[PDB]
Each structure stands twice: as C-alpha cells, then as structure tokens.
Amino acid sequence: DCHLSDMLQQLHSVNASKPSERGLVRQEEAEDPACIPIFWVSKWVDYSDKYGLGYQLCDNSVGVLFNDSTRLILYNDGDSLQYIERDGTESYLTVSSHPNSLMKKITLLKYFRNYMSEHLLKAGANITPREGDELARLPYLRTWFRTRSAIILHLSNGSVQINFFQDHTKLILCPLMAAVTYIDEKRDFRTYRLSLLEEYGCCKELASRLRYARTMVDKLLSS
C-alpha cells in the first residue's frame, strides 16, 4: 500500500523531530486551510456481531463494510450506489435499478442510515470540507479496527481517521496532502501540514496522538 507507506514515513518523520520538546512551540504557524480534507467519517455504527460496520461521510453519503468484506455506498442523492467486492472490483448502479442480489444489503444500509440520522451526532458538522476536483473521488471504507483507546478508519483515498473514545478527540491524516486535521476536546477543528509541524512544533496532546497514529498505521500495513 503506497498511501499507507507514505503515511508511515510522514509520521515517522514528524515524530522524529520531537515537535513538543521545544523552547518555542508555534503550532498555529503549521496550520494550512488548503489542506482541509474533502472527506471524513461523520458517524459510525459497529454491528459486526450481525452485519458489519455502517458509516456516514461528512457529505451525507453512507456506506457499509459488510462482514463479507464487500461495501455498498449510497451517495447523498439517495439513489446512486457503488458496490465494491472483497477484491476492490467496483460496480456502479442505483437502488431504483433494483439489482436482485443487492436488495437485502440495500435494506440493511437503509437501516444503518436511519439509525445514524436518528441517534448520532455528525463529527465536524460545522466544518466546510475542501472542494475536490477531478483527481479526487468519493472513497469507501477499506478497513477498520478498534483498540482499547480508539477506532481506526482507513479510507480508499488513502486517508486514515482515528477517533479516541474517552476524550472524543479525532485525527484525520491524509498522505497526499501529507497533513493531519486535529479535532480537539472543545471540538476545534484545525489542519496542519505535517512538515510544518516539524518546523514549528506542536502541543504535547497532538504530538502524543501522532505517536499513537504511527503505531496504528504500522498495524494497518502488517495486515
């Protein structure tokens, strides 16, 4: 995985600079709004006892990564679908086209969408994502896992998101922007160029989350 290997080097690099051990830390100088992601996971539901993991992206599209490792993505138009086999083979359809083999997985995706709409808050709700151009497209969830401290969400556009359980802080790392968006415990959303975080330093909070991230990316690469 090219994206993951780049991301591992970026994180090894920023951690190696020990960005929180400085006389002057000026984290705000490493902030770059041109680096804001196009997509992140807004809501998620782990029902992997029975079906798999449902999620919502910040655009209101929803997806499910089923226990058979297939995904079904419903776009924010409420109709257009993308189906991905275990091997990454993608199909493009619509609900209204009525694909017999998908009808049940579509019902299930609809029960996830409803659940999340009813009950869950939209992470990064106030935030405008960057406008994607013709080189980017809507990603699916390639894989995920939970540790005792977080859920780790790996999207097909190379982004890795990590949502921390006890404090509700979140990271969105993109290896192409080589950036990290940190959602802090006040729900402030800020995006940093990782290379500038090496230059200007960062808080102990963010630095410690970035060490954690490096470890989780190592876990993603092994598997």
Partner: peptide
C-alpha cells in the same frame, strides 16, 4: 452494538 457519539 457500538456507535460513534450520540446526540
């Protein structure tokens, strides 16, 4: 189930 942050 387990879920992200509720309302």
């Amino acid at each position: 189930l387990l879920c992200s942050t509720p309302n």
